[PDB]
């Protein structure tokens, strides 16, 4: 049996009620990983945190990631929220460097060489770029550089990256080398959209008055699969 520690970094790259789904994706991922036995101290959550009590939310204080889903917001730690959701903090977290963090909980992936790491990002994207709710945006070269650095630190056995965004293939295609012990998958290729799901007017639809999608198809595809 695996004797290493399992870590995760969960990142919603957007803000605003219309982007409900990205923070819902991340909260769902948090609950799933906790149910799997990952410890709270090893799961680092980035979310702007403007959804659960958004005035447009039909169910104040809750977030759901499927039409009949349970609340997934309760229990999610507020590691990096609001303007603490930024690239410098994300990189400090991935590299396990508490002294490079600015604002937020200070939780980082201070991992060892026999540990596993799971990173899940959900948001908006375009060719070569991922959204953040603060300046600057998360650029493909910068993200791949920080993964290379982490590999140079040697502080994991293997790392898995799941990525939800438009043109998300562009973030790794021809940029992520073999030999880093990193496996990544993306919702889309480098030239096409990725899609929300559980959207008004579509089947199945969110409850009345949500007027926003509850999740993203690639994201709920893996999370609902892991559940069953």
């Amino acid at each position: 049996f695996q004797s290493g520690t399992r870590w995760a970094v969960l990142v919603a790259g957007s803000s605003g009620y219309w982007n409900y789904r990205h923070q819902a994706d991340i909260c769902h991922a948090y609950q799933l990983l906790r149910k799997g036995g990952l410890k709270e101290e090893n799961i680092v959550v980035f979310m702007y945190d403007d959804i659960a009590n958004n005035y447009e939310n039909p169910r104040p204080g809750t977030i759901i990631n499927s039409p009949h889903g349970k609340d997934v917001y309760q229990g999610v730690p507020k590691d990096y929220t609001g303007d603490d959701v930024n690239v410098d903090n994300l990189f400090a977290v991935i590299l396990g460097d508490k002294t490079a963090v600015k604002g937020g909980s200070g939780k980082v992936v201070d991992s060892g060489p026999n540990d596993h790491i799971f990173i899940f990002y959900s948001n908006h994207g375009g060719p070569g770029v991922l959204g953040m709710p603060t300046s600057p945006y998360l650029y493909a070269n910068d993200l791949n550089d920080v993964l290379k650095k982490k590999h140079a630190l040697g502080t994991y056995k293997s790392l898995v990256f799941y990525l939800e965004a438009c043109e998300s293939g562009s973030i790794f295609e021809g940029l992520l080398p073999e030999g880093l012990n990193i496996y990544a998958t993306t919702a889309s290729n480098a030239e096409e959209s990725s899609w929300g799901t559980y959207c008004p007017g579509e089947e199945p639809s969110p409850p009345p008055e949500y007027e926003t999608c509850l999740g993203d198809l690639y994201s709920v595809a893996w999370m609902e699969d892991s559940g069953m």
Binding site: W18, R21, S122, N123, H124, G125, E164, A165, C166, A187, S193, S194, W195, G196, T197, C199, E202, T212, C213, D216
Partner: peptide, 4 residues
Amino acid sequence: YVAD
């Protein structure tokens, strides 16, 4: 559907 909304795109990302």
